[PDB]
């Protein structure tokens, strides 16, 4: 007899891994740029005048990773 | 006799991995740009004058990854 | 007789690994840039004039990793 | 003999008291206000939540004022 | 014989009392206000939450004032 | 014989009392205010939470004032 019974009888409850509200509220801002003879070759990545706001939220939560084997 | 019975009887309840409200409210802004003789030749990525707001929310939740094997 | 029975009878409850509200509130700002003869040749990564705010939240939570094996 | 000859032979030339260009360029902005039980009774002047930009240029120009009399 | 000859043979030239360009460029901003039970009774002047920019230029120009009299 | 000849042969030239360009460029800012039971009774002048920028330029220009009299 070969018998294989992985259960995972599990509970994740009552606000266990939440985030709150997400508010992104920029207060305006000002930018001015003057550029003349500028010259770019192979694979240049350039950002000359910037006023930049990022809210990035890949997180929170109840991440579970599991693996089983049984091998002959 | 070969018998395989993985169960996964599991419970994720009551705001367990929720997000709140998502609010993005940019307060306007101002940008001015002057460019004269510029020249770009190969794979150039450029951003000269910018006022930029990004809200990115790929997260939250209860991500579960599970794998089972049985081999001869 | 070969018998495999991993259980994982677990409980994660009541704000166990939650984050509060996420507020990103930039207070405006000011940027000015003047560029004359600049020249970039190979794989150059450049950021000349910037006022930059990043809120990055990939963390928080109840991360669990587990692995089981049985081999002959 | 009574005689009265006030002349004023005067010259005001070539940008003598001029202004340049006037530019008013607000970069946006953000305001939030919550008021519950407030009460005002007599000649009250109030400004609770404000984001305000004033450009006031009451000068410039060629205003001339002159008055003449001769009395017995 | 009574005679009165005030001349004022005067010259005001070539940018003599000029102002340059006037630029007012607010870079945005952020304000938040919460008020519960406040009470004002007589001639009260109040400014609770403010982000305020004033550009006031009452000068410049060619203002001339003159007065003449002759009395018996 | 009675005579009165004030001449005023005067010259004011070539940037003699000029001002340059006037630039007012606020760099944003942030204000937060919380008020519970405050109470003001008579002629109160109040400023609780403020971020204030004033550019006041009352000079410059060619202001001339003159007065002449002759009395018996």
Residue numbers in the entry:
A (entry chain A), B (entry chain B), C (entry chain C), D (entry chain E), E (entry chain D), F (entry chain F): 307 to 378
The publication says:
The assembly of tau into amyloid filaments is a hallmark of Alzheimer's disease (AD) and other tauopathies. Cryo‐EM revealed the existence of disease‐specific tau folds, which are challenging to replicate in vitro. We studied three full‐length recombinant 0N3R tau forms (the wild‐type and the C322A and C322S variants) using an RT‐QuIC assay with brain homogenate seeding.
C322A tau formed filaments resembling AD paired helical filaments (PHFs) but with a more open C‐shaped core. C322S tau yielded structurally distinct filaments with an ordered C‐terminal region.
